[PDB]
Amino acid sequence: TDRVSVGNLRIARVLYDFVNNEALPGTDIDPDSFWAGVDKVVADLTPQNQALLNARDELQAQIDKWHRRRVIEPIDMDAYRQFLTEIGYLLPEPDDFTITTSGVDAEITTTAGPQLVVPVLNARFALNAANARWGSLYDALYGTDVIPETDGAEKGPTYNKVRGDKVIAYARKFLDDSVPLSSGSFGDATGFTVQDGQLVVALPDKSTGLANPGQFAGYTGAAESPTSVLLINHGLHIEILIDPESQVGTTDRAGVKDVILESAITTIMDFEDSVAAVDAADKVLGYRNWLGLNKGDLAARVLNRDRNYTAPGGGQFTLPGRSLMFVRNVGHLMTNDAIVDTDGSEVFEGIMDALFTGLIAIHGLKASDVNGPLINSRTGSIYIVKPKMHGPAEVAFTCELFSRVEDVLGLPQNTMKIGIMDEERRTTVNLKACIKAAADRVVFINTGFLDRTGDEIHTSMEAGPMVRKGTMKSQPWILAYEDHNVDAGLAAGFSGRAQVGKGMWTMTELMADMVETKIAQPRAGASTAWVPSPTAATLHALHYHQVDVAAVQQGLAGKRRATIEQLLTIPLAKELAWAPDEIREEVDNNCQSILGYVVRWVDQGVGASKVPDIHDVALMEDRATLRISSQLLANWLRHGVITSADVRASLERMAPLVDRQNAGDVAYRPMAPNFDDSIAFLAAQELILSGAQQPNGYTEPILHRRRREFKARAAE
Ligand SMILES: O=C(O)C(=O)CC(=O)c1c(Cl)cccc1Cl
Numbered sequence: 185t186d187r188v189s190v191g192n193l194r195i196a197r198v199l200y201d202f203v204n205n206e207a208l209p210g211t212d213i214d215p216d217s218f219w220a221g222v223d224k225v226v227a228d229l230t231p232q233n234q235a236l237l238n239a240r241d242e243l244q245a246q247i248d249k250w251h252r253r254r255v256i257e258p259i260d261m262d263a264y265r266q267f268l269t270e271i272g273y274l275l276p277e278p279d280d281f282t283i284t285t286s287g288v289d290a291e292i293t294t295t296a297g298p299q300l301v302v303p304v305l306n307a308r309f310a311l312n313a314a315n316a317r318w319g320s321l322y323d324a325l326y327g328t329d330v331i332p333e334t335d336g337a338e339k340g341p342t343y344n345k346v347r348g349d350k351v352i353a354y355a356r357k358f359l360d361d362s363v364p365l366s367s368g369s370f371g372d373a374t375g376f377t378v379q380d381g382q383l384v385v386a387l388p389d390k391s392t393g394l395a396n397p398g399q400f401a402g403y404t405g406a407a408e409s410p411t412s413v414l415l416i417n418h419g420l421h422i423e424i425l426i427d428p429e430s431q432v433g434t435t436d437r438a439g440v441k442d443v444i445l446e447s448a449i450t451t452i453m454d455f456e457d458s459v460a461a462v463d464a465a466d467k468v469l470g471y472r473n474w475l476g477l478n479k480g481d482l483a484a485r486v487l488n489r490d491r492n493y494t495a496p497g498g499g500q501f502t503l504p505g506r507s508l509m510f511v512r513n514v515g516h517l518m519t520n521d522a523i524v525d526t527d528g529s530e531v532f533e534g535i536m537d538a539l540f541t542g543l544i545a546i547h548g549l550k551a552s553d554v555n556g557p558l559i560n561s562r563t564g565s566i567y568i569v570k571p572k573m574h575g576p577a578e579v580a581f582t583c584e585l586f587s588r589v590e591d592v593l594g595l596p597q598n599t600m601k602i603g604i605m606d607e608e609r610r611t612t613v614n615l616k617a618c619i620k621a622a623a624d625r626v627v628f629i630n631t632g633f634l635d636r637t638g639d640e641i642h643t644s645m646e647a648g649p650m651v652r653k654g655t656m657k658s659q660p661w662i663l664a665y666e667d668h669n670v671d672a673g674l675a676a677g678f679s680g681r682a683q684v685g686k687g688m689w690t691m692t693e694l695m696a697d698m699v700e701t702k703i704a705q706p707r708a709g710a711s712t713a714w715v716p717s718p719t720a721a722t723l724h725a726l727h728y729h730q731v732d733v734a735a736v737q738q739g740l741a742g743k744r745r746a747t748i749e750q751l752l753t754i755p756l757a758k759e760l761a762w763a764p765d766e767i768r769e770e771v772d773n774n775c776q777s778i779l780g781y782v783v784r785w786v787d788q789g790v791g792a793s794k795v796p797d798i799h800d801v802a803l804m805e806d807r808a809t810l811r812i813s814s815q816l817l818a819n820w821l822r823h824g825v826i827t828s829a830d831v832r833a834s835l836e837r838m839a840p841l842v843d844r845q846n847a848g849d850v851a852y853r854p855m856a857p858n859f860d861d862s863i864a865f866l867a868a869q870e871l872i873l874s875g876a877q878q879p880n881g882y883t884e885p886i887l888h889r890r891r892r893e894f895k896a897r898a899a900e
Pocket residue numbers: 301302454457458607631632633634635636687688690716792804805806807808809
């Protein structure tokens with residue numbers, strides 16, 4: 185019909201044309217050979233892909249039955265452990281080893297700093313994310329609640345000097361704490377100059393140098409009256425901008441205009457849980473943005489050039505202006521009708537993403553005609569985050585998929601590197617083996633704690649009612665999971681070789697709380713962690729200036745801080761855990777978050793949205809937070825905590841409020857009062873009522889079906 189025949193495959197024409205006219209030119213890959221390879225790789229690897237998914241279902245069925253045949257309230261951990269080993273869930277731990285991944289860029293092997301994740305289908309957001317390698321600290325402090333909006337310090341239509349002076353003082357303390365002077369405080373500086381290759385800071389009664397002059401990295405403008413001074417601390421750059429005639433500079437004792445922080449060191453361009461892509465048209469929209477980013481010519485606003493500096497001694501150098509880009513492919517579960525076979529069966533989407541995003545990534549290995557030939561990877565790697573894997577065999581399948589794609593693309597073996605999400609229970613408890621199976625490709629491990637919480641609930645669905653969603657974040661199993669991840673990475677030699685990463689801060693407006701609390705992640709040895717915005721990347725960067733992550737990792741070496749038993753502690757709620765009002769709060773909490781996210785997913789194809797929780801906190805929602813919410817309500821329904829009328833009432837209670845939050849979005853179609861005429865409302869209900877029967881609690885089967893249903897109704 186609208187499809188192209190290649191071997192056993194029938195490729196949607198819009199995808200075929202995109203690859204041929206846009207992605208292949210410039211790669212020197214013969215098109216006929218590429219498409220033949222697509223057919224061959226799909227033909228060869230689809231059977232094992234399916235067997236792996238069938239094995240998940242078989243393991244879950246056995247675990248479900250294990251719980252159903254037992255009465256004893258305290259789970260006998262010795263028996264449970266023996267059972268998981270019996271059925272092949274818990275595998276033997278391999279001998280100690282060190283990863284051998286080579287050809288990785290310094291932003292990954294060495295630098296500790298924030299990692300930003302952004303939906304690749306939004307070109308404006310993706311551009312801003314790539315440019316977020318540098319960000320204004322003054323803008324992040326002035327614009328967020330990190331500076332409280334106390335009396336006199338509020339934001340207004342125009343600049344509030346009381347507030348600005350607080351921003352200035354906050355940043356002076358940061359400089360004092362990060363790049364200390366030999367004597368005195370940056371707060372009292374009157375000027376900066378460069379003399380004999382040394383930074384000299386003028387104070388009211390004297391001048392001083394840096395306590396550690398090696399932290400002076402360079403400057404711009406004349407040495408005797410610079411326009412900026414560049415410092416480095418824990419491998420991250422700080423730039424003091426000097427302009428006494430600027431709007432902020434005129435108020436500053438040294439004429440300082442701003443403090444620029446190296447912020448988003450790396451960025452993950454997401455094809456997975458933060459985007460809605462259910463057919464070839466949606467996939468091409470995302471592939472084309474990924475292509476623009478790797479060619480440097482994406483424009484919505486354009487991509488930044490590298491930054492030019494004068495060295496202390498007076499030579500010239502440059503620093504990268506863009507964040508180093510990963511791409512998050514989808515995982516092993518879903519198919520997509522962008523390609524179907526001769527039976528009409530859809531092709532696995534993860535296989536397609538490896539082929540198409542790897543092809544497109546070749547452009548990021550060569551000079552771009554649109555900015556000073558910036559190469560995403562100078563060392564020659566393609567960085568793919570692979571989510572939602574369950575255990576070492578699934579990691580091995582990813583490595584073999586990448587190997588076969590490298591052959592189709594004519595790339596050297598192991599060009600395609602893997603950032604492993606540790607976000608499913610069966611990977612958590614076999615993590616050493618998972619790393620070993622990717623020992624020559626792995627570039628990070630990351631605790632995707634929200635997916636991991638959803639898997640936790642689904643895996644033990646039959647055991648009993650789980651604690652409330654907010655309680656999960658502090659349960660024994662998750663704290664052990666976080667420490668176990670760091671322990672495994674460090675023991676595999678990640679320090680100096682690969683990132684050890686932690687999860688996303690989702691409260692996009694609570695930046696004071698983020699700055700107060702997220703420091704725990706670098707303090708735990710994580711060399712990176714996820715932020716939702718360029719502004720949050722700049723603010724999270726502060727933590728890497730306060731915490732010497734490299735020293736932390738060095739002091740953690742050899743420690744074994746989590747046992748298998750701690751990892752397997754199921755978050756079952758205690759008897760009589762909740763009052764009636766607390767149960768209704770949690771139902772309303774989850775139903776509002778589900779509805780607010782799903783309505784924009786199904787009706788507008790938006791895969792990540794800010795949705796208020798029960799306490800009015802704006803939360804960046806994506807599929808993982810939806811997985812938790814729907815699995816938790818499904819678990820409470822499964823065990824008699826709530827009735828199906830409680831669920832219906834809550835969904836109908838919260839639905840008009842969600843309509844109110846989205847009012848007038850032109851393309852907004854209200855759910856109330858005719859709930860069962862709304863495909864989005866029905867999707868939300870189905871996610872809860874079918875949640876116990878979704879494989880590992882994944883939300884994509886229902887979301888994809890319902891989004892496609894919406895698109896089909898709109899077309900007629
Ligand atoms: O926790 C894991 O499972 C993740 O993988 C996290 C994730 O996607 C995400 C993103 Cl990028 C933005 C907003 C909210 C979340 Cl939850």
